[PDB]
Amino acid sequence: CASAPKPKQPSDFNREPVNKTVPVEIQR
Amino acid sequence: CASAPKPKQPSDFNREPVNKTVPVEIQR
Amino acid sequence: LDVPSSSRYDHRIRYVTYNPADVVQVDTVLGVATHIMLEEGEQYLTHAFGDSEAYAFARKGRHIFIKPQAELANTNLIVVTDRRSYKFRLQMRNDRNGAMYELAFRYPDTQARQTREANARAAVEAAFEQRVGAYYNLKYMMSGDKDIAPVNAWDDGRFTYFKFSANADLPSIYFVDAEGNESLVPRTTVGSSNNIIAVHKVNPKWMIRLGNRALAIFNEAYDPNGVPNDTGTASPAVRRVNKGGN
Amino acid sequence: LDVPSSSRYDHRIRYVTYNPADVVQVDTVLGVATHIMLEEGEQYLTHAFGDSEAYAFARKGRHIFIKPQAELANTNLIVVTDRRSYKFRLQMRNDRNGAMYELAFRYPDTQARQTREANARAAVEAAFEQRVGAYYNLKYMMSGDKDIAPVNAWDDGRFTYFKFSANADLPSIYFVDAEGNESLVPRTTVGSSNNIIAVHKVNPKWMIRLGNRALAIFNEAYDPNGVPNDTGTASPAVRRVNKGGN
Amino acid sequence: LTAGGGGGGELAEKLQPMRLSGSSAGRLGNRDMLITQGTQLDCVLETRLVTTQPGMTTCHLTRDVYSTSGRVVLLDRGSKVVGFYQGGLRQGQARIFVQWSRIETPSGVVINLDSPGTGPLGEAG
Amino acid sequence: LTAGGGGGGELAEKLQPMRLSGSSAGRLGNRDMLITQGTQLDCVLETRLVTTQPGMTTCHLTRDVYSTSGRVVLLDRGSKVVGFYQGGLRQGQARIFVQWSRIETPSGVVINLDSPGTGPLGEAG
Amino acid sequence: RLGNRDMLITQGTQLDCVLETRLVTTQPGMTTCHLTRDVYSTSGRVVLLDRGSKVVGFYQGGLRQGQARIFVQWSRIETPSGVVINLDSPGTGPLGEAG
Amino acid sequence: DRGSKVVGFYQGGLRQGQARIFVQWSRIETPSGVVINLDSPGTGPLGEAG
C-alpha cells in the first residue's frame, strides 16, 4: 500500500555547462 | 493528525540593516 | 675529558655541558657524597662500575649518589639510560681539597629544542593577532523580533560575527539552508566582554532564537566563492603542519 | 683486525665499522669497564667467551658491559644476534693506558639499504607528482539544484574531479547507471584547501545530493575505452610490484 | 660490575523516640571564587530535543554568572553546557529529567557541574 | 663457555540528607588542538539507511571543524566518519540510535570519537 | 595518524562487487561475488584490490516476519594476482543499506 | 538573616488521594556566608506537612 519515498529527482530542464572557466588544477 | 509545532517564523516585513554604525572591531 | 666548570659562588658546585663524544672527569675527595643530577623525565636503565666495591652507589629516581669506599679507587662509571649513556673517570683526590659536591648537566640540544619551540609560539601568536589584509562584509539585514537583534553583524570571508549589546542575552544562532531548514552551526564567543558570537561559516541567511522570539539575518552580499583555506588555520599567515609523521 | 678509531674529544671513545669477516681489537685495561652496544632493536641470542672468568659479562637489552677479572686476560668474546654475529678479541693491556670506555658500530649495510629506500621513495613521489601526458575532458553539463553545484568538473580518463568553492558545503556524489539507479562510488578529497572531490571512476552521468537538494552531472564526451591500467597505480610512471613472493 | 517488663507491643513501638542529631553552622571559605547550591544558571537550549532515544543536549549561557558575593564573573556568557537525558517518559509524564554535566567557559575554564536541568522557572525536568 | 531511640521509621527515613560533593574548576590545556564536548560536526549521510539488519554507516564532513579557540582547522572537510546502529526500532519509535565511531581526515589523521549521531538540529538518533 | 596510506584501505570504504550466486535463504549457505572496479588505496594512488577479485561470504539464520533483508558477511577476497586478505565485513545493497 | 537561600529537594511523586508532596530542605546560606545543614521538613504556610 505504502512504499518508501524516493529522493528528489533533479529537473532536466536548466542544463548548463559546469565549467565556465578552465580550472587552475589543469594548469590553464 | 497532530504534529510537533514548528518554532516561530519571523515576519518578513520589517527588514532593516543590522549595522546602524560601523563596528570598532573592524577598526573603524 | 670534559672537566666540570666551577661556579662563581663556590668551587664545590661545578657544571658540565653534555657531550656524547666526551667523558666527565669527576675529582672526588674522600668521605663526601657527590650528587649527580640527571635530566627530568630521564629513566635510569643500567650502570656499571669499574669496581662495585671501590665506590658506594645509591640511586633514587634521577638522583645519583656515589661515595668512595676504598683507597686508590680509580675506576669508571658508565650509567646508561633510555636517552643517553653517561661517562665518568673517577679519579681519587689524595689531599682532600677542591671537592665536588654535585655535578649538574646542561644539554645544548634540549635547550635549543625548547627555545626554538618558544620562538615559534611567539611568532604564531604575533601572526594570529596581526590579522592583516582582511576584507569585511557589512551588507546584513534583519527582520523579526528586533529585541534580540545584534547591534552589529559582519563577516571577514571565513567567519560571521554578531555583536550584542552589554544588556542583551546572548541568543542561539542557527544556519538556514535554501529550503529554509535550520541546522546547528559551531560558534565561538569572542570579544573583550564576550559580546561577539563568531559562527564558523559564511551563509546568506541566518536564524536567531531566544525563547519564543525569532529574528532572521540576511546576507545581502553573499560571495559563493570566498577565500580558500590553504593553511589549515583561521589565519593566512599561520600554517598547520603535520607533526605526527607516521 | 679492526682497530676502532678514537673521537677528537676523548681518545677513550672509539667507533668501528662492522665487517662480518673481521674481528675488532679491544684494548681493555684493569678496572675500567667497557660498554658495548648492539644496534637499536636487536635481539641478543647468546654469547660465548674464551674465558668465562677472565671477563665479567653483564647485559641489558641491547647494552653489554665487560670488565676483566684476572691477569693475562687475552681471550675472545663471540656474541651472536639475529642480524649478525659480532667478533671481539680481548687483549689486556699491562700499563693501564688507552682504555676503551665505549665502542660503537657504524653499520654500512643497514644505511646502504636505508639510502636505497629513501631514493626509491623520492623517485616514486617525483613520478606521482610529475603527472605528464594527461588528457583532460571538460565537456560536462549539469542540471538540477544549482546551489550545490561545483565551480569546475573534469576528468583525466581515470578519475572524475569536482571542484567546489570555499564557501560551499561538500555534498555527496553518487554513480548513476543506464537505468537511472544510484550506487556508491569511492572518493578522495584532494586539493590544497580540500575543495576537490575525486571519484575513482569515469561515468557518463553522476548525481550530487546534499540534504534535500539534488543535482545531476552529465558527461558529454564519455569515452568507453578509456586508458588501461597496466601498472597498478594511478600513474603510468609507477609500477606496483609483487613483494610477497610466495 | 654492580653492587648487588516489655509488653505493650503496639503502643510501645509507637512511643519509640525519634532523635535527630543537631547541626552546627560553618562558613564558606572564599565567596569571590564560589558558586553555591541553588544558584540558577540561565542558558538557551541549542539542540532540538526528542526523547525517543537517549542523547546529549547542549545549551549556552545567556548571562554572566557572578560569585555568591556578586563581585566576580565566574562563568562567562556564551559558555557551553553539556548534558544528557535517558530512559524516556512514562504514561502521564510531560517532563524529562535532563542532567547537565559540564560547562566550558569561553576562556577555557572547565568545571564538572552535575546538576538537574529545569524549565525557565525552575520546575524539574 | 658462559659464566653462570530509633523510631519514627518513615519520617526519619524521609529526612535523610542528600549530600552532594562540590566541584573544583579546571582549565583546558591547549585549546588550539582541542575539540571539546558538545561540538556539532555537520556531515552528509552517504549510505542509505534501512534498519532491518544491524549495519555500518558512513558520512562525510561538509565543513572544516575548528578547534575550541576557533583558530586551527582540526578535522578537514571531506573527512570520512564511520558508525553503526543495531537493535532495530520498537513500536512508537521513529528514530534509531546511530553511534559514530571513527573519523579520518583527508591528510591521514584518525581519531576515535564514539559519539552519538543526531539529526540536523541535535535531536537524538 | 595512519602509517602508509598507499598500502591501506580504511574503514568504510565501499567495495562494489557483482553477485554471482543466486541467493535463496531457505538454508544457510555461502555466497560469492566479483569486484567490478579497481579498489584504490586511501591516498587514491595504488590499486590494492584488482577488478575481478573473488569475494566469498555467507549468511545464516533466515528471515523473521517483517524482515525483507538478510545479513551477509563477506569473509575473504582473493585478488587475480594471488593476494588474499581476510575482510570480515558486512554486505550491503547498492547504496549501503544493510543486508 | 533575611534573604538567606535555602535548598531542598523532593522525589517519589504523589500517590492517589495525596495532594501534598514531601519537601526536605537541606542547607541554608546566610547573606554573610554562614552555612548550616538543616535537614528539616518543608511545610505549608501554617505548618501542614509537605
Residue numbers in the entry:
A (entry chain O), B (entry chain R): 17 to 44
C (entry chain Q), D (entry chain N): 21 to 266
E (entry chain P), F (entry chain M): 150 to 153, 177 to 297
G (entry chain J): 199 to 297
H (entry chain S): 248 to 297
What did the authors write?
Conjugative type IV secretion systems (T4SS) mediate bacterial conjugation, a process that enables the unidirectional exchange of genetic materials between a donor and a recipient bacterial cell. Bacterial conjugation is the primary means by which antibiotic resistance genes spread among bacterial populations. The recent cryo-electron microscopy (cryo-EM) structure of the conjugative Type 4 Secretion System (T4SS) encoded by the plasmid R388 revealed that the remaining VirB proteins form a large assembly organised into four sub-complexes: the outer membrane core complex (OMCC), the stalk, the arches and the inner membrane complex (IMC). Previously, we solved the cryo-electron microscopy (cryo-EM) structure of a conjugative T4SS. In this article, based on additional data, we present a more complete T4SS cryo-EM structure than that published earlier.
